[PDB]
Symmetry: C6
Subunit: 221 residues, 6 copies
């Protein structure tokens, strides 16, 4: 991450061992379950692209995912370059160059250049921009390693409603969908794919009911 | 959370890895037992809505609960909007907008906007307001995942009184009730649902006795 | 707890995750053995009543005890109110009210009010006053969950003296007694309830002997 | 590592116990898998050559590797000496000497000399230079303890594509290759060495496809 | 422990949870082996008598020892009182009283009084004085729970010399003895109680030999 | 260790619980393997002789070693005294005495005296001098508890070369030898004591080959 030093200057903070071990443990234990993302985001708050790279490099295994991640990073780095053309020429002495997509991703930029941009007034938030891309890739990975689709989730004959909902929202959390699509999957699927005895009750509760109500209503069978 | 920096400015504090791992462990180990709430409250002291969101996002599983939580958040966000109408128009340059319910819940607001409100003089405590709502939802969850009601708690024939009381107060802690309702459940149920041998003794101690006294009095059988 | 900020002002310190997890572990592992009290006292040093409440709320189980604890808190809160009558009227604008027993216990007081009192010049140490009450209740709990009395502790025929003493002082630590009563239990019981072979020796050492001496003297049989 | 003290002066920071234990655990658990490198780099940020030496010295076992490491360090130290000839003579009183390769590697230099160079204006970044060499050696070790070559990686008849890719990129991460060579191994091998059923599909997707697409396309068989 | 605050004043530092848990673990795991003492001393550096009391109170079990500890504390507190008579009278308003033995042991003194003495110019180091007494008691305990005497340590027929020495110095570390007595036990016992084959060799090495030499000399049989 | 306080003065830093527990764990788990030394050195950076003593005192067991350690300390303390004669006389009021060997080892010196010397301008680095001696003893211990000599290390008929080298360098790390002696053991033994099939190959590589090359060359059999 980054802080201002004793005096005026602005210095890099080494990522702690705890922050590191935590990120590695998350991944060993949770693979690419959705909750990994928040965790990465949390553990990376204030990060430079180096740091972010570091963090990603500390994962062993999941290299298929990691390659998808790079391709997503790449995809975005191109789009950045296209929206912000740079001017290759005489870079005015000790004066800051404009970052390219590769400079944001850390491949063509130093830590010192990175800090430089991040603490500029006004700042170029290269860490956050790189972070946004990384999370994009992380979503994709999450979808890809979701073993089931929302359409394959039906309540079991003898499955309490609470657990169907659990499985449904869990599955739903791991989908490619805008918010509007998830909403739609909910409105269409949740009641439809409930089992017969509970489905009848819920049809009767009508479309304005809360989940608390739905669960209450299917409690007794 | 939030602190004032080296100099005048007011900066975000990343939630630590310990605070994170602790919240995740709590939930893996305790599901939605009542004590989870304090723990969440403690681990979240000083939090911005982002942070709170982060914390909630780091839980995998319990997605039925988490959906109830959102609906409760939503319910409250509406009520806020209704009690505080905002004026959509020209937001005066670099000047702070009034938060909506969605801005409090973090969905339509940035961290920078959030800090802004939290450290304003006089402040809009958006973290505490969002926290209050989240705890509301957390109570509801707690009730919903309580597998037994206070009325189903009777002392076993051969159950020491100490343990009946344990089960009764534990059950009672997980109920929807104002303080006045819990009091009432106590005054009506605790002695009534004690087993015969202990019940006689307690009727004889009379209604002003403490629990220490009650336990003392049923010690010997 | 509480500290003075960067500048002049006096701010709340969130109780750490370590302090929290430690208190929870203590109780899971030790129930209400005497040593729990020091531990609570240590983990709570500098605490506001909120914090103390937090800590107590984080224990799941032991709810019979916790109810005794509240009754003891209540008992004390009444006594406080009786010794310090407050004047209900126009609370002079932004000026500090006198705390009631409920304000000390945290039920009718905010954190901000609490800090206010704790850092007043001269201060009202509401945390320490609430702490003293809580420890009182904690003693009572300790006595109540002590499964044996000092009078039931006799040295086994083939029990080395060292271990009898261990059991005796352990039992003695968990009693309701002033210091003078414990002293008395010692002077009357320890030698009397030793087994015959060791008892004879100790009668011969006479009443001024130390425990080191007593143990030395019963070493050889 | 290094920080500026209370006042003007610039002082050494002891490497923490956590940073140490973490590095030792990494190696016990992961031997010389690629991810070890980032970890070492992370745990060593800001390090003086002493510290780096310390860290390396704390590994027991892997002494064949460690000897390769020294030889690589040595190789580099020579190259440094050759590119930067020093002038042996009267070292001007309390004035800084130019570092040799051995002074960078820590063998002929003190901590005080090391700090001196690192915080000079303009600085001689001896820690980073030594770090770069150490990582070079660490790469070599990584290659040497890679038990399989990229050419020996073929998808199993009944191996989902996802896992072949995993094994391929993992193997590829542990190779001696410029970026251009890895690219080349990819373009030549990945599709070629896929199993027949998946290979046909991928030939049909054509050379511009992403891995996400490739995995999508071989999903269904 | 104790530190000077933000501004001029001198404030108490709560003993950390780590320092606490560490002391409790030491004792659960090591009982009263000699090394416990250093550990206690280390964990208690800078402590007030409250803190020290706290630490001692956090041990459950070993109550026979703990009672010996109090008697030793008591013994010393008396001796202090006798060497430093106090003058009971009008304690000059807000002016510091002279500590008694009970004030040093914490029983008749507050934390505020304790800090007061510890940071006085010139200081009364009540923590160190109480610490010295506590360690005295701790030595005694150590001796008392040493199950074997230095005279009972003979090298086994087939016991390598290294291990005899280990057992001998370990036993010797747990004895009541001035330095001069330990020296004497060494000079008299170590060689004498070695087994015949090794004893002959050592007699021949003569009285100026080091242990390194002794071990070298008995290596080969 | 040591730091300058809030204001001008220079104060002792208690060794942390983590630094302590870490040193104890190292030794329980690793006995006197070579890597223990770095670890001790790392964990002790900035230490006063008290602290160092503390650390050594916290090890239980290994008392034969610890006695060798003292003798080595003693040996060195004598040599110091002989090279720096002190003048016993009127020690000029509140003025610093010259340290003896016993004052460096901590036996005749206080912490306050120790800090005094360490922070003097110009300083007497008593911690580093004592540390150097302790490490000397630690080397000796390491040699003594090395169960095998470099001459007894031959490659197994069916032992990959990598593992022979591992065993050889590991053994070599635990020897009494100047750098020049180790070099010599290498040049003479490593190839000579390799097994026949690998030995022939290595003779053919010639004396300038690296270990990387040697391992490469014996890879294939
Ligand atoms: C955890 C989760 N499950 C989902 C299933 C489908 C789609 C999204 C999700 C999410 C992420 C998810 O939406 N998380 C919430 C935070 C949150 C988590 C858990 C309970 C309540 C609030 C979030 O990030 N935001 C901004 C948010 C905050 C309030 C209301 C709605 C959204
Ligand atoms: C822990 C608990 N069990 C209950 C059962 C029924 C209703 C509520 C509860 C509670 C929460 C509960 O009431 N917790 C207490 C704190 C507390 C916890 C444990 C012992 C003593 C004090 C609390 O939050 N407040 C403000 C409080 C403080 C003093 C007296 C009464 C209330
Ligand atoms: C630990 C313990 N066991 C008891 C048995 C009967 C009554 C009380 C106790 C106690 C608490 C107990 O008395 N603890 C001691 C601290 C202590 C603990 C252990 C050894 C020495 C000193 C204490 O709090 N104080 C103020 C104290 C200090 C010195 C002398 C006497 C009392
Ligand atoms: C982790 C990994 N696997 C490889 C296989 C072949 C070659 C190299 C590697 C690497 C290291 C690897 O390339 N790591 C990445 C960081 C990274 C790791 C994981 C996912 C995305 C980005 C890196 O260090 N840099 C500078 C980088 C950043 C963005 C794009 C490309 C490279
Ligand atoms: C650890 C130990 N074992 C003993 C056996 C008999 C008597 C005493 C002991 C001790 C304590 C013991 O003497 N510990 C040493 C520290 C120490 C520990 C281990 C190795 C070297 C130095 C100590 O405290 N001091 C002041 C000391 C320092 C140098 C030389 C001699 C004494
Ligand atoms: C770890 C080790 N194994 C040995 C075997 C024989 C003799 C010595 C050793 C050592 C200690 C050893 O030499 N450690 C190295 C640090 C080190 C450790 C591991 C790999 C590379 C560099 C060291 O302390 N120094 C000053 C050093 C630094 C660079 C080159 C040569 C020496």
């Amino acid at each position: 991450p980054i802080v201002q030093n004793l005096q005026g200057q602005m210095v890099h903070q080494a990522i702690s061992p705890r922050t590191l071990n935590a990120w590695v443990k998350v991944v060993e234990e949770k693979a690419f379950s959705p909750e990994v993302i928040p965790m990465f985001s949390a553990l990376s708050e204030g990060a430079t692209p180096q740091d972010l790279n570091t963090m990603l490099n500390t994962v062993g295994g999941h290299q298929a995912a990691m390659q998808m991640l790079k391709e997503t990073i790449d995809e975005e780095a191109a789009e950045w370059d296209r929206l912000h053309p740079v001017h290759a020429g005489p870079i005015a002495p000790g004066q800051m160059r404009e970052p390219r997509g590769s400079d944001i991703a850390g491949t063509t930029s130093t830590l010192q250049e990175q800090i430089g941009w991040m603490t500029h007034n006004p700042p170029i938030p290269v860490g956050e921009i790189y972070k946004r891309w990384i999370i994009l890739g992380l979503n994709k990975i999450v979808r890809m390693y979701s073993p089931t689709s929302i359409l394959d989730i039906r309540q079991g004959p003898k499955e309490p409603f609470r657990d169907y909902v659990d499985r449904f929202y869990k599955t739903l959390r791991a989908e490619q969908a805008s918010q509007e699509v998830k909403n739609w999957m909910t409105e269409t699927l949740l009641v439809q794919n409930a089992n017969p005895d509970c489905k009848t009750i819920l049809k009767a509760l009508g479309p304005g009911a809360t989940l608390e109500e739905m669960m209450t209503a299917c409690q007794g069978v």
